[PDB]
Symmetry: D2
Subunit: 337 residues, 4 copies
Amino acid sequence: ARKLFTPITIKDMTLKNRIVMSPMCMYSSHEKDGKLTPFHMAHYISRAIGQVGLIIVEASAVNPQGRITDQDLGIWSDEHIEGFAKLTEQVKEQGSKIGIQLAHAGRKAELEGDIFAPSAIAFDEQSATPVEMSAEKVKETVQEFKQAAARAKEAGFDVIEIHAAHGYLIHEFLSPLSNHRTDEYGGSPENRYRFLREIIDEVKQVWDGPLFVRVSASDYTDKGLDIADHIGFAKWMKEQGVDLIDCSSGALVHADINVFPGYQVSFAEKIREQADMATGAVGMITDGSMAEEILQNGRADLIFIGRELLRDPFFARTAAKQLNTEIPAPVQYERGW
Amino acid sequence: ARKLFTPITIKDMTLKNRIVMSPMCMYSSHEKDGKLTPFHMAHYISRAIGQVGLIIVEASAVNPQGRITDQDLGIWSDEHIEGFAKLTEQVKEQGSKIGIQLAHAGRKAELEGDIFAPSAIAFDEQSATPVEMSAEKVKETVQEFKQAAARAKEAGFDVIEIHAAHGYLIHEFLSPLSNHRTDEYGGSPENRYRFLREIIDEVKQVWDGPLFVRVSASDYTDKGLDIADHIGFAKWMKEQGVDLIDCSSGALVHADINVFPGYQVSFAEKIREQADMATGAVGMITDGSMAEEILQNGRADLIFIGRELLRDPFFARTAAKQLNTEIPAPVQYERGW
Amino acid sequence: ARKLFTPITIKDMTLKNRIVMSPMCMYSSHEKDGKLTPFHMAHYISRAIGQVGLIIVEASAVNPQGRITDQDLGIWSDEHIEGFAKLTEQVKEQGSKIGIQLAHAGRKAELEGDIFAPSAIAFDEQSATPVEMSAEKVKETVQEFKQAAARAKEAGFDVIEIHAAHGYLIHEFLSPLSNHRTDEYGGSPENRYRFLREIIDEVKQVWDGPLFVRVSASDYTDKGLDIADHIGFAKWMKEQGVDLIDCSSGALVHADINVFPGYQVSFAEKIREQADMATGAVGMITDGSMAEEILQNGRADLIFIGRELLRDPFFARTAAKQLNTEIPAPVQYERGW
Amino acid sequence: ARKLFTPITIKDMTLKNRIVMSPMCMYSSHEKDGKLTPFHMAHYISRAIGQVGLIIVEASAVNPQGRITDQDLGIWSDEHIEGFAKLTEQVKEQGSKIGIQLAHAGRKAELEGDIFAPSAIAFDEQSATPVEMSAEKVKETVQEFKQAAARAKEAGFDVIEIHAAHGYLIHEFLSPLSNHRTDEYGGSPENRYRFLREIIDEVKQVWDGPLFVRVSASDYTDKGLDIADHIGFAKWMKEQGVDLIDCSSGALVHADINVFPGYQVSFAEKIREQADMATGAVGMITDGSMAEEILQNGRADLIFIGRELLRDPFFARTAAKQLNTEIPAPVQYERGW
Ligand SMILES: Cc1cc2nc3c(=O)[nH]c(=O)nc-3n(C[C@H](O)[C@H](O)[C@H](O)COP(=O)(O)O)c2cc1C
Ligand SMILES: Cc1cc2nc3c(=O)[nH]c(=O)nc-3n(C[C@H](O)[C@H](O)[C@H](O)COP(=O)(O)O)c2cc1C
Ligand SMILES: Cc1cc2nc3c(=O)[nH]c(=O)nc-3n(C[C@H](O)[C@H](O)[C@H](O)COP(=O)(O)O)c2cc1C
Ligand SMILES: Cc1cc2nc3c(=O)[nH]c(=O)nc-3n(C[C@H](O)[C@H](O)[C@H](O)COP(=O)(O)O)c2cc1C
């Protein structure tokens, strides 16, 4: 069979295929309370009906002021557990595994009131200057990721992913372009990584399941982070028990990025090879042929699909056809698939 | 602008495009109570997110023993109103109009216990022989369609379609092959049409909105009904205020049917021309080009899509692309569509 | 088997499928002598390798001043026979049948010097006013079509098509908008049809094989010709022994034409039904599904494909795949098809 | 613009895009004299009309007994020059550059009479045992490649490619599995490479244009050649002035090969990186997205397309559409592309 449709086991979780619905913000929590809405349910569950092996729920803030927008999903409150519990139950009932992306927007939070970051440096010209987190505020945030993970476990998620990419809080700490701290959380690569190190260790105190970490493998900026730096971080994450690194890139600051089909795959293959860590490839992957090639040539272990799943919720079926192979259809659509 | 994406107003309902999700049974009411489940919600709402102009909910039984299977949706009880109320609200919120198909499986009901029909004639050698409805029972069934329509109105549906096709109860009364009654509901075309006539008149006492009727325009059998018969019924339906005839075919009895792309279009075109009645074309229509041709050549007014919407929930986008035109995308997917 | 890939026999010619490469001018006779060039050979033969059932060569002038442009193909001289003989042999060798479209551009000829027409009326404000053909000149032109047909037979063509459409010479005689003659070739429909009648009768004196006539089934203009007129001409053509009417439309004069997929199909269906004449459907037919529908619903006998064959020379294979059926591939490409 | 459609210059040859028609035997020289036929002309020229940047003509034997089959093209005689001269002229006239693959089947020659190889070892159970080439016979063959190159230059080819792959003669000398010689052409890697070294040096005495070499980057067999060996050969070829290595694989002997989209790309990228040599990627590349990714991620410099160009001669257009970009169409098809 095609590798794209061959199961893979990570910890005590077996995925029926290697297609992953990349986390994508829907800005649909209209009550601004971080809760799920009917749209979210239809949005996610339809891709489970569509046979996506693993569905990763969009960035969910671990702190209200850590949201990107006031319409973001949240997991900073026990009040969020009930809705997520229904979502995981329904997604899994359709045959897919489900994960959640724990996040904090840091200096990129588009909210009124003080926003936070490792250093008081604004994202750009049109952004507010963030407040430099006190050492204790940083430690409180670590606890919030821990608390959020505990809620995710209770809600029934199969996988937890830490959002350490796209110029958000953790990414801000990792990069010297945004982290000018002179305390235990700044300076050396080890210190810049400390925030993430503590988040991983604390999350593991309440979560023993598959743990993913999404990173921006490059800042595409002089004096910023590059793949070499991330290969280093990957080795440390492996030692800590991280199961897979979801390889994205950019967004820490404005930069020129050459975008094209599979433009971030090199990051996934280099980390996989040099850090001996399973990786997720993402970035303009839109057809089954590319997906199969990435897996067969050992460039990544899972294929994250974003925008193509917005155009085609049933990408799994489309990819199967493109690869001239057969996959099980949801029972209700046996007469059409 | 392409005709497929041109609005049409029926009564007080304006459809934003001519794409209709054909009613398709999902056999997913696992509690065997005819109620909706999370699967149904995601299944239908996803096509609304997908911009389908009109979504018609699958055959919903007006009487429990009128179900095709014990996992069919139902609308025989006021308890069914709550679920449907949530569904219509959520579908309309995405920007689509919604309808429901009122039905009764007649002799094709796959349930334990007596099943009913106009005459005690089994569908085939593998089916149970139905019980001939008493005149009283027939009139009670008319009232159940009326009562069901009332529930549909309360639930917020935009359109109601009467299922008078696919060999089910109403179709059984219409055809001489299945109706050998010696009372007012059998014999001449007037008598054979009487059941449907009374259903339409009664439904109109509680529902003044768009009213569709799906028929099997031919039995493809000697001594059975053919397009000439249905043109006759269509003229009577027009006088009664039916707004559109959804043109399907067959299934009253086993028959040899030449299936091919647009194989039922001739029925929609003839009824449209000869009965001066708006029609819905359905049957192996899988792309925007065929849909546009059918509309532009005046063969039908609405394009019903069945299986292609099971393969591609976002057929509307796919069709827009095939026709080299643009249509509004759901706000949440503007970065992908 | 799909009707699109079902054989059909016209006279003594059996076509292996119903796909026809519509005649399309290539304006590539760079020596301005109407002779074939390597481009023409590869252009046509590639579609034969592509399994097209019948390839009709572009408009070939029966008189040099009857060319549309000075780079048109010609068949006004015996010197044109050698090239055509090689082309028909090579096309047939690949397994396809081949035809040629005999033509005369009339007032739409874009050449230096006097151009001719039934009446001195220019095509539009940008065109030169043609010279009214003397009765002698008209009869000489009839002989040139006859002589051209003789050359086509000698060159080995399987089918000959008379170009009586797109506002060219013959079409000009047929329509009241362009024909104001006061002799035997103008006035009543009998007189306006006379030019074509004589061409058909004379051609038949030297050619007994399949004979096609392409017409513009409507002028889309007040006081111009419409489908009713062409149904009348079609009945006369049937009596004369014409085997099939290739149904196109317009171009006699500028007009508002609603173009859409299958916009000329109604013409092919009406002529087929009312004149009991085999017809070729053409006009925005781009996929196997539409082609199959047209054939199965009895709207035409052959499917003429134009621009789609310019985008996809191997449309036959593409259509077979779309129809989920199999067709023989050229032996040399068995490892790819 | 897309890299796939950006020109690239090699020596004094500029390709308009980076799509290459991979050499593919057509077994169509029916007279068994190695000459071109009308089919060959239509076959190749149609892809030039189709905008393929570089068309590489199928394996052409440098010696009659070096043909794979008696229906192969040849270039062992001056009698072959005339036909090739017409072919290059016509392909270039349509806008493409053209190359020819100089070949010798060695022990895989399916011809009657003695066949040759470095050692008397048969390809398999159903193959004849080849005659071990005397040192002089090897030197004569080197001269034949030289002579063939001289003919190719006279015929007007833009590129010459040496076929050192697919288990044929040169490949046989390169691999220790098939080369057991104990003279100057066997033993060490240097000696096994000597035959190719001499062919390259001699060809360069009569040809100063772009020179490609196709290799089988792996024998997929224990004790056979692997990518490490070919990276070594690549460095030697670079020193000799070879411009690009066309990276295929296998066929020396029967072996288990895992085939999938882009299954030979790793060979192209490793040789490109470690030998600092331009490379051509080939092997189940069927869409523009994969092609663009290969080029943008620096895995190869040219994209060789084989079977997809047999299914779609106009792959260039299809790929352009897939990449949402525009490319010039042949003037004759401007109204369709
Ligand atoms: C509407 C939208 C919302 C997104 N939200 C998130 C998010 O919450 N978390 C994240 O890590 N990436 C997010 N992304 C980035 C995507 O997950 C994905 O990595 C990116 O689009 C590259 O992949 P693609 O080409 O398959 O879409 C978003 C992208 C889009 C288009
Ligand atoms: C799984 C399935 C369930 C269906 N259930 C219904 C139904 O409840 N009512 C109805 O009128 N037609 C029903 N149909 C018939 C379809 O609505 C449609 O008319 C038929 O599939 C022809 O169209 P298509 O070729 O676009 O699928 C069903 C079809 C399928 C495949
Ligand atoms: C470049 C080009 C040249 C054409 N030349 C001719 C011609 O010589 N004779 C003719 O009858 N139609 C000619 N046509 C009209 C086509 O045969 C065909 O009827 C028309 O394109 C409608 O079909 P299509 O939508 O499949 O392309 C031409 C069309 C194109 C695009
Ligand atoms: C019919 C056919 C003939 C071929 N002949 C040759 C040849 O003469 N020389 C060569 O180097 N490769 C030859 N090949 C191998 C192809 O060039 C190509 O490298 C292979 O098919 C892998 O690519 P693809 O997946 O794009 O077809 C041939 C392949 C096919 C299907």
